[PDB]
Amino acid sequence: HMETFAFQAEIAQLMSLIINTFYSNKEIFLRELISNSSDALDKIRYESLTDPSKLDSGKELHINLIPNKQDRTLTIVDTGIGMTKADLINNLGTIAKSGTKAFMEALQAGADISMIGQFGVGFYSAYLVAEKVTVITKHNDDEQYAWESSAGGSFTVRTDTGEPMGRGTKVILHLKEDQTEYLEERRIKEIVKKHSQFIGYPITLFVE
Numbered sequence: 001h002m003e004t005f006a007f008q009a010e011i012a013q014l015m016s017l018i019i020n021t022f023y024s025n026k027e028i029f030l031r032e033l034i035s036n037s038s039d040a041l042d043k044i045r046y047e048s049l050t051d052p053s054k055l056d057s058g059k060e061l062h063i064n065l066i067p068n069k070q071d072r073t074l075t076i077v078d079t080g081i082g083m084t085k086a087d088l089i090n091n092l093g094t095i096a097k098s099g100t101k102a103f104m105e106a107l108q109a110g111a112d113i114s115m116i117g118q119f120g121v122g123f124y125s126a127y128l129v130a131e132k133v134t135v136i137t138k139h140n141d142d143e144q145y146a147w148e149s150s151a152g153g154s155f156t157v158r159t160d161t162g163e164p165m166g167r168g169t170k171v172i173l174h175l176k177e178d179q180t181e182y183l184e185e186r187r188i189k190e191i192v193k194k195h196s197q198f199i200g201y202p203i204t205l206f207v208e
């Protein structure tokens with residue numbers, strides 16, 4: 001059921017840089033994940049203009065932010081296009097190679113980790129705050145999958161038997177012990193207002 005894969009060498013190098021570099025401005029991970037959700041919602045919305053049946057798996061286009069203090073997780077949920085098995089295992093890693101190389105060269109010349117999204121690899125900024133990331137996803141053309149990685153240089157993919165999603169992506173951040181501020185209502189609200197106030201989809205910050 002669970003298959004294990006090696007990241008492309010450039011992606012393992014990027015993840016190590018994100019985990020090892022001293023960089024205090026960790027809060028930017030949330031803007032990067034919300035921007036990915038917004039891009040995924042724009043993609044399904046635009047495809048639905050030529051094929052309305054693409055919304056048979058759910059008409060609502062939104063982003064939810066769900067903290068869970070008991071589990072020490074922050075989850076970013078969207079009803080965007082979702083990812084196929086081929087996206088998870090091959091396509092996302094392949095497309096990211098040029099952007100990863102460009103980003104690592106830009107950092108050597110004076111750029112900052114907060115610019116990661118300009119290189120299309122902002123998802124990996126999740127490792128600024130998470131020791132493990134679990135991604136549940138469902139694309140209209142494929143089955144529901146669970147992707148997972150604690151940065152071994154490896155990740156896993158399995159068909160998911162959990163709560164059916166309809167369509168979209170859930171990024172579950174298993175936070176590092178010293179990063180629990182990202183479970184606080186006031187802190188998430190502050191970050192969303194600072195970096196994500198103009199996103200074109202409703203962002204609901206759940207509370208406990």
Ligand SMILES: Cc1cnc(Cn2ccc3c(Cl)nc(N)nc32)c(C)c1Cl
Pocket residue numbers: 036037040078080081082083088092123135147169171
């Ligand atoms: C390996 C990897 C790379 N990039 C990403 C970021 N991404 C790529 C496609 C995609 C969609 Cl359709 N929705 C969301 N919200 N995020 C997405 C992930 C989620 C993984 Cl798992």
